[PDB]
């Protein structure tokens, strides 16, 4: 009851077309295995370019990077097994397969500002 560090973000490689499905699958595993405290949220980037005409109309869903997703966790081998056991997804990315490396928070809040800048005043 002494380890309370900056709760970490890692990256998970997801196949194309399942990104929301991967997010809701991790949410389902969190709510099923009942370690909702050990696990956190998932920050997948979304932006909305809107065009009235030209094929797709009134909306166009694009994102910064489709191949990867950012997920909130702590360091735990049980969490590692839980993430790996999720279907329709590959797993972590890092220096070594056993323990992925974290991500510097400077570009984290930079991309937070980026999504805040792009995403504002809906419709």
């Amino acid at each position: 009851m002494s380890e309370a560090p900056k709760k970490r973000w890692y990256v998970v490689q997801a196949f194309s077309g399942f990104e929301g499905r991967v997010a809701t699958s991790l949410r389902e595993h969190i709510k099923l295995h009942n370690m909702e405290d050990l696990f956190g949220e998932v920050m997948v980037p979304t932006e909305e370019v809107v065009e009235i005409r030209g094929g797709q109309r009134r909306k166009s869903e694009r994102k910064f990077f489709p191949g990867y997703v950012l997920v909130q966790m702590v360091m735990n081998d049980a969490s590692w097994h839980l993430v790996r056991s999720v279907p329709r997804v590959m797993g972590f990315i890092g220096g070594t397969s056993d323990r992925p490396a974290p991500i510097s928070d400077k570009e984290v809040d930079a991309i937070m500002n980026r999504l805040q800048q792009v995403g504002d005043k809906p419709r």
Partner: protein, 50 residues
């Protein structure tokens, strides 16, 4: 002679050895190694003798 060349003398380390050998570059864990060993030779989902 086989036991002389044996690199391990305990169940945990032998499980670690086989777990690392069959799938290289994975985190060696007691539970994972034991589950994989049991699922290779004693679980009807994968192993099955007619």
């Amino acid at each position: 002679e086989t036991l002389r060349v044996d690199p391990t003398n305990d169940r945990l380390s032998a499980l670690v050895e086989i777990y690392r050998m069959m799938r290289p570059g994975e985190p060696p864990t007691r539970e994972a190694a034991e589950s994989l060993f049991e699922n290779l030779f004693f679980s009807e989902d994968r192993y099955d003798l007619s």
